[PDB]
Design a protein around this nucleic acid. Sequence first.
RNA 1: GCGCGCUUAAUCUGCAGAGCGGGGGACCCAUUGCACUAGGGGUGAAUCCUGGUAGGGCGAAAGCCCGAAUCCGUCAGCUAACCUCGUAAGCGCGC
Length: 90
Amino acid sequence: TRPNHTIYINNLNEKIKKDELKKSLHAIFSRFGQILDILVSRSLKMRGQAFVIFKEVSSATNALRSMQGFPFYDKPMRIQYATDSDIIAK
RNA sequence: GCGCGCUUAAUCUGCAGAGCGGGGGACCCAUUGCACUAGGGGUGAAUCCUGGUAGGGCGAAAGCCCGAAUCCGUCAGCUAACCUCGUAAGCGCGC
Ligand SMILES: Nc1ncnc2c1ncn2[C@@H]1O[C@@H]2COP(=O)(O)O[C@H]3[C@@H](O)[C@H](n4cnc5c(N)ncnc54)O[C@@H]3COP(=O)(O)O[C@H]2[C@H]1O
Ligand SMILES: Nc1ncnc2c1ncn2[C@@H]1O[C@@H]2COP(=O)(O)O[C@H]3[C@@H](O)[C@H](n4cnc5c(N)ncnc54)O[C@@H]3COP(=O)(O)O[C@H]2[C@H]1O
Ligand SMILES: [K+]
Ligand SMILES: [Mg+2]
Ligand SMILES: [Mg+2]
Ligand SMILES: [Mg+2]
Ligand SMILES: [Mg+2]
Ligand SMILES: [Mg+2]
């Protein structure tokens, strides 16, 4: 719940492949600001989740506030704030 | 060495078939998971608590024992089709 450069999204449709999911997430979130990276994994623990890392925290906050609850692949996205991502911390 | 047996998927036929087993792997169902570095998982009865113990083997029974080892490599839920490998080894009696 603490503001971060990286936003954490879950409740995502697990049938959607990594490439397509990342492409769609970039498509939707790039309008809020420059995206540093998008981490997606389909492992047992990490599936249904994604990490969108923004260049600016303001972008992260606006994206989160704006896309909170968005119908994405027939499921409402659940968005919270990320610890800092390795790319940012470094 | 051979004849019965025993744990085990570990046995038969002339490296390969048959038989017996292990793992991956859709739809369906279940899973809401804070990652970018031991974690997660598989064979087996062999797991846990600080000698006990879950769980297993022989035995009609009472009783006697095991309660090991090791591997995949950061990854594996269920799962037809399908893809794959294993068929090592350790003993008890007799001649
Ligand atoms: N899969 C398993 N799960 C749990 N526990 C297991 C197990 N396999 C074996 N055990 C236990 O550990 C001991 C190991 O015996 P092993 O098979 O080396 O050696 C055995 C066996 O090779 C042989 N044996 C046992 N019963 C036999 C029988 N009825 N006929 C012929 N030979 C027998 O003589 C030895 C006597 O063993 P014993 O039964 O006193 O003790 C056995 C058994 O109690
Ligand atoms: N789903 C999974 N998740 C995580 N790790 C997994 C896994 N599946 C397999 N592994 C591990 O990786 C190896 C893969 O070889 P595979 O299981 O084909 O090779 C196995 C298997 O094909 C066969 N096997 C194992 N247990 C068997 C059994 N009970 N009956 C018949 N064959 C068996 O012999 C080999 C034994 O070697 P081992 O099991 O040490 O070697 C296994 C195991 O250590
Ligand atoms: K088991
Ligand atoms: Mg062969
Ligand atoms: Mg099994
Ligand atoms: Mg599976
Ligand atoms: Mg038996
Ligand atoms: Mg899977």
